């Protein structure tokens, strides 16, 4: 009921698809950042929302800025998120799998960068 994901200095996540076993009551994403660049020029987060909500989450997050982890505080569209991390840093986020609803399309993404993938219930 966890996965390890990396974001590197080339604005790449090391996977584009996460699958969650339906047996999981909670699920944890462990984000790390190989590379040498710090958070103010190559910070990554891991953010989960519906596909429909992603644009607004990104737009509002970029308006909120670096010290808010490029996320709008208390954004109700964000199902789960990490903080923003630079190289060598780590953050984990856990969420309740019952938040993922039938028939919905979930995406994960980093808000400052063109980095995204899908999250699917198995
Ligand atoms: Cu990023």
From Swiss-Prot:
The record's annotation in PROSITE patterns points to:
COPPER_BLUE
- Entry annotated with the keyword Ubl conjugation: no
The molecular function terms of the Gene Ontology recorded here are: copper ion binding; electron transfer activity; identical protein binding; transition metal ion binding; zinc ion binding
Example GO CC term: the record gives:
plasma membrane
Disulphide linkage map: 1-24
Instruction: Explain the purpose of this protein.
Output: Transfers electrons from cytochrome c551 to cytochrome oxidase.
Domain Plastocyanin-like, by residue range, is 1-122
Could you tell me what this protein is called?
A: Azurin
Q: Detail which positions bind Cu cation.
A: 44, 110, 113, 115
Where's it mainly located?
periplasm
Where does the record place it? Periplasm
Report keywords, A-Z.
Answer: Copper, Disulfide bond, Electron transport, Metal-binding, Periplasm, Signal, Transport
Superkingdom of source: Bacteria
| Listed InterPro entries | Azurin, BlueCu_1, BlueCu_1_BS, Cu-binding_ET, Cupredoxin
């Amino acid at each position: 009921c966890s996965v390890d994901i990396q974001g590197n200095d080339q604005m790449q996540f090391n996977t584009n698809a996460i699958t969650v076993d339906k047996s999981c009551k909670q699920f944890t994403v462990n984000l790390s950042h190989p590379g040498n660049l710090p958070k103010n020029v190559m910070g990554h987060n891991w953010v989960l929302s519906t596909a429909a909500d992603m644009q607004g989450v990104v737009t509002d997050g970029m308006a909120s800025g670096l010290d808010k982890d490029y996320l709008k505080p208390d954004d109700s569209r964000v199902i789960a998120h990490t903080k923003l991390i630079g190289s060598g840093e780590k953050d984990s986020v856990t969420f309740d799998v019952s938040k993922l609803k039938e028939g919905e399309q979930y995406m994960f993404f980093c808000t400052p960068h063109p980095m995204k993938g899908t999250l699917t219930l198995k």
